[PDB]
Symmetry: C3
Subunit: 429 residues, 3 copies
């Protein structure tokens, strides 16, 4: 029985571990995670709004993973020795591996002066919770609201979802008229999402904001978040201020120190994310795989204010399906290799209703896109939450019917047989 160590107990890690397990019962699998729970991240904005209890959107891992014959180690992974094939945890426990899957997700950078002190974030359950405590003060004393993304940000979705969910909340409380709302993004235009748009997203989102009276400034670098104002800089280099009593800003992401310590064949020097090829396998150390946000994928377009590419839920689900297959195939001496399609369904919950975004694939050129908005989309996200948590709880992230439902509805094929894995992830075999 070969040994696969997975670092990181999130969407990517869980999915790779369950994929490997369901494809090969006679396989020793160890998962290492610094958090004792899997957290459902797409529900963090709602948690930040106080519309979710943490226990509803999390699954304790240590009592669960043994049920699927997976070893859970509840520590941080400190370093990787890819020559020795070894992972070292923080307490000093060394673990040998035959294959390694890195899935540590994003490491937050609050790159704006004062952002970490005077702003709020929704990227972790921990941050989402101290956001909730702060919104409490906004409702009590309605001042101006500023929301958005700093330079380097690569996950733009949640900030739109927060802006619009907050609008809804204030409007339910009959105080929206006491609260100006500005959205500031490093995107060249609204609805760029770090992907150069999804269909006519720029137009869909611009009307959404105009209809719901949400002022916006795009194509600018947010430099500072003071207790009382947000300072930013446009392409001429002049700085501007905007009054703000409450702010929520997306951090930019970088890779973790664990990856960094594997050397510059594994760790991308620029951002410390995991160097991978079309097959989400490391070029140099071919028993190392990266899955999820931590994977180094080049941007789709070099925008005037730096932006990066989002790794969304469905993309990662495909990454995990491809890496699991490629590991299994290597073990079984099958030369076949798979690249993930990297397509994305994306639902942005605006409170009462929601935006549906489908891009196939996400990195252009695209075969097709779907942009729709409705109440149905909001229910779909609540359903999907309930559904994903059940998958984590029942040992299968990729039940065969999900694949076929996605075929019938969207003509989506999650992974393809790759003829040549040498090349940037996202680039076409």
């Amino acid at each position: 029985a070969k040994h696969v160590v997975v670092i990181g107990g999130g969407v990517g890690g869980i999915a790779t571990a369950y994929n490997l397990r369901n494809l090969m019962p006679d396989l020793k699998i160890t998962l290492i995670s610094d958090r004792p729970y899997f957290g459902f991240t797409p529900a963090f904005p709602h948690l930040a709004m106080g519309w979710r209890k943490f226990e509803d959107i999390s699954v304790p891992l240590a009592p669960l993973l043994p049920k699927f014959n997976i070893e859970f180690i509840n520590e941080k992974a400190e370093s990787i020795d890819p020559d020795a094939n070894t992972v070292t945890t923080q307490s000093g426990k060394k673990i040998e591996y035959d294959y390694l899957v890195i899935a540590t997700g994003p490491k937050l950078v609050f790159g704006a002066e004062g952002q970490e002190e005077n702003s709020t974030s929704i990227c972790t359950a921990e941050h989402a919770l101290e956001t909730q405590k702060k919104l409490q003060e906004l409702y009590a004393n309605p001042g101006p609201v500023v929301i958005g993304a700093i330079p380097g940000v690569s996950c733009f979705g949640p900030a739109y979802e927060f802006a619009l969910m907050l609008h809804y909340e204030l409007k339910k409380r009959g105080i929206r008229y006491k609260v100006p709302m500005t959205f500031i993004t490093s995107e060249p235009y609204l609805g760029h999402f770090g992907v150069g748009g999804i269909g006519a997203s720029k137009r869909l989102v611009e009307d959404l904001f105009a209809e719901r009276n949400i002022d916006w400034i795009a194509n600018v670098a947010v430099k500072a978040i003071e207790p009382d104002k947000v300072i930013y800089e446009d392409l001429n280099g002049n700085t501007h201020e905007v009054p703000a009593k409450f702010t929520m800003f997306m951090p930019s992401f970088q890779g973790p120190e664990v990856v960094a310590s594997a050397g510059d064949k594994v760790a991308n020097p620029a951002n410390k994310m995991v160097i991978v090829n079309r097959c989400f396998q490391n070029p140099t150390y071919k028993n190392i795989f990266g899955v999820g946000v931590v994977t180094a994928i080049p941007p789709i377009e070099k925008t005037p204010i730096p932006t990066g590419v989002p790794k969304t839920g469905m993309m990662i689900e495909q990454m995990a399906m491809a890496v699991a297959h490629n590991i299994v195939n290597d073990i079984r001496n099958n030369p076949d290799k798979y690249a993930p399609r990297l397509s994305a369904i994306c639902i942005a919950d605006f409170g009462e209703d929601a935006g549906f975004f489908f891009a196939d694939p996400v990195i252009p050129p695209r075969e097709r896109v779907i942009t729709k908005m409705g109440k149905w989309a909001h229910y779909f996200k609540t359903a999907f939450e309930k559904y994903f948590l059940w998958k984590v709880r029942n040992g299968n992230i990729a039940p065969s019917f999900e694949e076929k439902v996605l075929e019938i509805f969207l003509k989506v094929h999650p992974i393809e047989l790759c003829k040549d894995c040498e090349g940037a992830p996202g680039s076409r075999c």
Copy 2:
């Protein structure tokens, strides 16, 4: 009995006077106006188009106000002595006052050079009927038509109405293809309206115009209107001209000389409009109130070309309602003071169809907006006119059911209890 004097027989004046008489049957009211008729301004564009007889959209006041025990003075109020509590008329007749309501509407400034001479306006019924003559000449032998708003304009609606009405008319006599149409405006973008747009009004008006082949220039200053052309200036300081056989440009507004005649405590030095607080009361002379266009309200937005903020019929009806209660509460020694909501239902007639706008409030940030378009809206404009005229003739501008109706359909309340009057009108109390 206490003595209140209403200066001005327009929307605000009549509304305020009627509300007072209905709250307090035994209160003496004197209304002074320089016109023996009440002008229904919302129908003046149709009068310029020749779809109304002046007699149908006017109400003679002399035989009417004495029916509600309102003393009518058919003279111009010349000066105001606020320390001596007196108004002095054109013939020099001194009338003393306990309370003063100023509702003199706008003093028109034809601020582009050559505008009074070479252009038409639709602001007064005199100018409207004049415009009718010029349209006749136009139909006889077509030429370029340019319509719009100069710098300083705060009433954009009627220009949009007129452009689109004139379109429908030129088209219905098959002569449109021989008539270019350009709309040039001081608004930063189309459908800004001085209010920073209403929902996605900017997208909606740009589409209306493109469909109806109306050319447009926004964010420029009309500097000159000549017999043959219109000269305007963009933000670089560059001059451009546009050929024109017929022009109709909106003048800008300023306070009258009668207001100016009271100190710099009643008359806003920058524009001669009445200094009022949240409760539409003068900060220093507590027995002076302003209603309607005459009131100084800070612009919602400093736009690159100076624009002001409209005071719509519903906004004014609300002002008048708030002021009535404020005066009566003060007479009765009741500490309750009321702010108007300053929301707008605004219908722009386009000939056979029309655009329905609803802003709550008008001054951002907004609780909600409605922007719809259709036939029904045009018919609702004809029917509201008939309704409003009936209101003036029957001594109630504010019957109880009307408020309940607006509450049921739009969830609007015309007036709020104001915790503290001290602050700019429109600002949140």
Copy 3:
């Protein structure tokens, strides 16, 4: 018998010749054409896509024309001597005329460097059949496609068609996601078509390109087309580059030499196109008339990158009716002159669906427009093709019913009685 000579076996020539035949059976008519067949130009993009066989979209003229007493000479008109009322052919045959109709269509100019040998065009049948061959080269070797219009272009429609149709095909073959697409135009914005847009056509095309992932660069000047790339130049004169495995660009138009061989009273000194008045008649030589693409019509607006006005089928077949009547009324001593209305009804085919455009007249100011999209519009283009070729084959381009159907469905009269022809073609009597 008077003798009318038509140069041009295309839409313009045929429709003038047929029209004259139906108005005057005893009139002598001679058609000079270098090509032995009428080509149904609107179906050339489909021919390039390989969805038509040449034989289906063309009519042999040599056997056909004698059936309507039209003498067909299959040679290229070489020179026109307006002082001798003659036309000399490539063999040397001098033909006299009492009236002349110039309808040679466009002489293609491949302005960009490398355009003629490296790009491909769809403007003639030979060029279109040649493009099919290169499209084969692409389907087997997926690479970047770029498509558009060079400076000075005037037929933008076929490029939009082609881009869209090509997208449809790439999707059919499942290779769309392996093939980027960029549309590069001299138009100031998308959907300008050299007409200052039709209705809200800019919003419409932009949105069309977004859903389908066709990138675009507008308001630039294409200067080079190399085997592996396209070089364009922006308004700052800064020179840019984009990769290209396959290209397809519209050439600009100029007048033929046969026109140039007459005075500069007949050939416009700037473009060699035929000088005509409102009545598509030459101001100097009153018995010379021009029909179709060869006619000199001023640009609707002076665009940052030069552009021209399209001459669409409906416009041309209206020139033909106007010119016809003008020759007939001269023969019959009727002082009456007609101008064509010049309204367009242009269906842009996209493969499985299509874009309906109606502009009446094409040249602003307009009486009305209709811009719509759907499957029906695609079945309408196929239907119209079958219908038009029937008209060619059956000898009447303007059946009475067709004008009455146009009247009651679009309120379209094809010609207007014109009190004064002296002026630019397309300007208003």
